[PDB]
Design a protein around this ligand. Structure first.
Ligand SMILES: *[C@@H]1O[C@H](CO)[C@@H](O)[C@H](O)[C@H]1NC(C)=O
Lengths: 48, 49
């Protein structure tokens, strides 16, 4: 019986816009879309 | 005409440890998945974002 999976901590800016200030700025125009993803990944780690 | 690699500059994560601010104000920091002999020289170079 499996008990847990590998815990992941993907990051919005580093994954999408690697060290690009303009790209990060245009990501900020998307609102808090990805803070949800960070919170959900923290959650999945916590449940593991 | 030689071969050079390319690696991540320092992609990791920062987690802050802290009791309730109603209790104290001291804070201890984490640096996720990075040998921090590398950040110890990094703070010396002040290259830490
Ligand atoms: C990470 O740990 C120490 C401290 O830096 C050193 O042996 C070396 O940098 C790394 N060791 C391994 C086994 O990756």
């Amino acid at each position: 019986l499996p008990v847990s999976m590998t815990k992941t901590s993907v990051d919005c800016t580093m994954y999408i816009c690697g060290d690009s200030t303009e790209c990060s700025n245009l990501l900020l125009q998307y609102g808090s879309f990805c803070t949800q993803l960070k919170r959900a990944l923290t959650g999945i780690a916590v449940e593991q | 005409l030689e071969i050079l690699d390319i690696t991540p500059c320092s992609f990791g994560g920062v987690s802050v440890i802290t009791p309730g601010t109603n209790t104290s104000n001291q804070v201890a920091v984490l640096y996720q998945g990075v040998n921090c002999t590398e950040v110890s020289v990094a703070i010396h170079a002040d290259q830490l974002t």
